[PDB]
């Protein structure tokens, strides 16, 4: 049978492999007829230059538009032949091509997925088809208040580093961008060790590694230099920005404080805190009886329509903070009742309340692993991140670290008496002037 | 590990279970009472009933629940459709029993306190609003209203004049009528059969009574048009397909994947879909077309839901519509048939793999059949689809009465007589 500790123990473990030129392999076997095959590259925006800015998201489109061996829309008709779905997406630190397909068709799968990564037909017929679509998306993307307001947040905190910039880059580059830079950008960042292959499904390991093998052994995917590694720590600028617009009905806010990177012990402690403060939304069936002290109050009077806490960790850096929507007369009262929470944690926290935080994390961590792709997707970033480690059962072992004195020693670092980063989007007007917030981070014991 | 063990009771309530290796352990409970069981004076009840899960049980205060569940770190869900309401609940390997304890009390031992009902009233509007931001919702609910008379046309949401009209009695009656031990199905996943098998027989045995089936839904013609300021027309065009559990109900599913286009490649305009392609040739810049198929117990509908601008709307329909006639004229390609069936197998298997997604399809058979069908059987049933059958089936769509709904600026919209 299965007991909580026992259920950790029987899982197909990580497999690992190398090729000669620095490509990696890894996998797992779920005894399942379907499989995810994918690719995860670390080539981000924070590498790209001021002229190359946005090229990454630009390239991201062209791949499926037809390629060296299989011209435009000959490629897709083979994917739709298998009936396999096909997907790609980008992120500031990562780029991912992957496929969900039956275990059977895997022989073509990689050999298809192989080609797209490197050989790409680049035809200005496609470019002008593309250069519109982006200049179509930019102007629309104003329509979503959420995605925007973040692009405020980075730029305001990180100003002066390659990380401080938009994914898609300013509009003007989209016009001027020529496939010269692309080929250069192509040439630079797509070699191994950067690249990583992964998969999960009916595959095991061996039957993959042979059909890992030959292109890409491979088309290289090389290793020379490209210097090393274009990367460098980034500054933290305590600042503010306000786009004050009084037309719109509601007023977003985001407040944040800087935090550690991927691999670090404190990364776990803070995972738990932001579970405890919890989150509320208009439409829950919670009511006024919820446990989360901001889900009881802000549900009572609907001080804010909804808010969630986010946690983002970059290579050497991470962001902590919340995102809340509320009506303009109400905005003050969130800010106070918010800073109540962070400050009652860093002093007055308690053993009992920890548990309800601790449990949920065990819950979400596990339920995050249902399904083929969510597993595979994890494996991809992990290798680039913590190395090979997929420390599943170890997670639990790392959790029991958490104790009362653990939390209050952790959060005493990053919260009490710091410089926040505020970014907001109108009708902001009542949002207090800066020197209030800074004077609201540290209790005087009131 | 072990495969599906489903056990009738004398009571008739199906139970089934598996034993997993995972710390994930989840339970579900399905009931046959959906929207189709609301009556004229009975409207809007189910859509209230679905929000009341947190109210005070018979034995436990509404407070002790909500703090209780979260302390464990559990999660409670509710789901409805036009047919089967399902209370889903999930937690860690260990704690299920305390949580298995609450699941009954909610559905087994309700109490509706008039002072705890009235406070919840305003919630509906907040709920109803965020639902209709996607008009692709709001188009559908009109559609059923056009294509029926008595039952299925009922909304999943509470009409507005009906808001202050919900009395506790109405609830407390609709509770016991359409809840009964014959109509319920309890499904575990990660838990041993016997533990599950024990408690269910105890609490969930009540009557008897009432399945009242009086809804034949009586498909009947009609159409609905609506004029709003929005600049993007939506359109649906539907004829009556056949009921679930038929090679036809299988055949239509074959037919859609031929025409029916979900995006299989991000940003890729689907070239394999004859429909979206057959249009784009003779027409202009943005639009969208997709086939639409859903099947219920006594009947199911088939059609295609389109989106365009105000000018193109007239042509988009006529273009796509005649394109179907081509197929009804005998035009066919066996490879596409062979290709489509592959998509179907793909679409189905990838759909099932996820536990929750798997969990739903389990009982979906249960309340309908009462058995379990391994996916292999599904597969072998898939390829049984004949070519002329597909054609002949599509020959029914064109050859039979149709219905429509449209929401937006209608200035150029055709009517069902021009088609």
């Amino acid at each position: 049978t299965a007991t909580y500790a026992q259920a950790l123990q029987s899982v197909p473990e990580t497999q690992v492999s190398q090729l000669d030129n620095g490509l990696r392999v890894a996998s797992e076997q779920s005894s399942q007829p379907t499989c995810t095959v994918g690719v995860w590259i670390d080539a981000g925006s924070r590498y790209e230059s001021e002229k190359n800015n946005g090229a990454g998201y630009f390239v991201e489109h062209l791949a499926f538009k037809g390629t060296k061996n299989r011209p435009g829309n000959a490629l897709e008709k083979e994917v739709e032949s298998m009936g396999a779905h096909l997907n790609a997406y980008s992120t500031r630190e990562h780029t991912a091509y992957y496929i969900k397909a039956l275990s059977k068709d895997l022989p073509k799968a990689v050999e298809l997925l192989a080609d797209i990564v490197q050989n790409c037909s680049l035809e200005d017929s496609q470019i002008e088809k593309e250069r519109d679509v982006i200049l179509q998306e930019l102007q629309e993307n104003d329509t979503s208040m959420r995605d925007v307001v973040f692009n405020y947040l980075h730029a305001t905190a990180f100003q002066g580093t390659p990380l401080a910039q938009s994914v898609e880059g300013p509009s003007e580059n989209v016009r001027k961008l020529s496939r010269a830079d692309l080929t250069e950008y192509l040439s630079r960042h797509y070699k191994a060790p950067r690249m990583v292959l992964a998969a999960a499904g009916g595959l095991e390991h061996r039957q993959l590694l042979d059909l890992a093998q030959k292109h890409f052994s491979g088309l290289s995917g090389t290793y020379d230099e490209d210097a090393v590694p274009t990367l460098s720590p980034c500054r933290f600028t305590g600042s503010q920005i306000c786009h004050r617009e009084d037309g719109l009905p509601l007023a977003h806010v985001a407040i944040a404080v800087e935090g550690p990177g991927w691999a670090h012990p404190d990364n776990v402690a803070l995972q738990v805190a932001n579970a405890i403060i919890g989150h509320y939304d208009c439409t829950y069936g919670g009511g006024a009886h919820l446990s989360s002290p901001l889900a009881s109050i802000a549900a009572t009077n609907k001080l804010c329509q909804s808010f969630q806490t986010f946690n983002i960790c970059y290579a050497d850096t991470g962001l902590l903070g919340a995102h809340f929507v509320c009506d303009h007369m109400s905005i003050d009262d969130m800010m106070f009742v918010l800073q109540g929470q962070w400050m009652r944690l860093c002093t007055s926290a308690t053993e009992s309340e920890v548990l309800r935080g601790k449990n949920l994390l065990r819950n979400a961590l596990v339920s995050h692993l249902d399904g083929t792709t969510p597993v595979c997707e994890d494996i991809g970033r992990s290798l680039l991140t913590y190395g090979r480690r997929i420390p599943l059962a170890e997670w639990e072992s790392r959790i029991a670290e958490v104790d009362a004195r653990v939390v209050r020693e952790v959060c005493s670092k990053y919260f009490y008496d710091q410089c926040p980063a505020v970014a907001g989007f109108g009708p902001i007007e009542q949002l207090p002037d800066y020197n209030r917030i800074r004077s609201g981070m540290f209790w005087l014991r009131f | 590990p072990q495969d599906l063990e489903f056990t009738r009771l004398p009571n008739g309530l199906v139970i089934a279970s598996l034993e997993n290796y995972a710390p994930a352990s989840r339970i579900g409970l399905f009931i046959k009472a959906g929207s189709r069981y609301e009556n004229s004076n009975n409207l809007g009840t189910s859509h209230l009933l679905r929000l009341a899960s947190s109210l005070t049980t018979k034995g436990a205060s509404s407070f002790k629940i909500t703090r209780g569940i979260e302390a464990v770190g559990g999660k409670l869900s509710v789901t409805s459709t036009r047919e089967n309401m399902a209370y889903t609940v999930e937690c860690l390997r260990d704690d299920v029993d305390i949580l298995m304890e609450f699941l009954l009390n909610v559905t087994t031992a309700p109490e509706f306190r008039r002072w705890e009902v009235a406070a919840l009233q305003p919630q509906l509007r907040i709920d109803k609003a965020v639902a209709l931001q996607n008009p692709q919702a709001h188009v559908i609910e009109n559609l059923h209203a056009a294509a029926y008379r008595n039952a299925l046309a009922n909304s999943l949401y509470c009409p507005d004049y009906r808001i202050g009209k919900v009395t506790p009695v109405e609830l407390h009656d609709y509770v016991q009528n359409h809840f009964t031990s014959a109509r319920m199905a309890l499904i575990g996943l990660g838990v041993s059969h016997p533990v599950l098998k024990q408690v269910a027989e105890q609490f969930l045995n009540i009557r008897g009574g009432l399945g009242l089936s009086g809804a034949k839904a009586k498909y009947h013609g009609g159409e609905i048009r609506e004029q709003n300021g929005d600049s993007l027309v939506h359109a649906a065009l539907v004829a009556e397909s056949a009921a679930i559990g038929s090679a036809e109900a299988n055949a239509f599913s074959v037919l859609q994947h031929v025409l029916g286009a979900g995006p299989h490649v991000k940003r890729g305009s689907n070239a394999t879909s004859s429909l979206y392609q057959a249009v784009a040739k003779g027409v202009h810049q943005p639009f969208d077309v997709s086939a639409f198929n859903a099947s219920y117990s006594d009947s199911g509908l088939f059609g295609f839901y389109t989106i365009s601008q105000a000018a193109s709307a007239g042509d988009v329909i006529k273009a796509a519509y005649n394109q179907v006639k081509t197929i009804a004229q005998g035009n066919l390609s066996n490879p596409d048939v062979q290709a489509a069936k592959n998509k179907l197998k793909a679409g189905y298997l990838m759909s099932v793999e996820s536990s929750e997604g798997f969990l739903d399809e389990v009982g979906s058979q249960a309340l309908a059949a009462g058995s379990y069908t391994p996916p292999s059987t599904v597969l072998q049933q898939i390829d049984a689809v004949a070519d002329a059958d597909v054609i002949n089936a599509a020959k029914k769509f064109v050859s039979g009465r149709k219905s429509m709904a449209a929401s937006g600026n209608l200035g150029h919209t055709p009517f069902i007589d021009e088609l």
Binding site: - | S53, S54, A291, A294, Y305
Partner: peptide
């Protein structure tokens, strides 16, 4: 198309589908 549709009320999250 659609399922046709669905609704999810529950407690901790909330949403609608199709």
């Amino acid at each position: 198309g659609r399922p046709l549709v669905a609704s999810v009320s529950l407690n901790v999250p909330a949403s609608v589908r199709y």
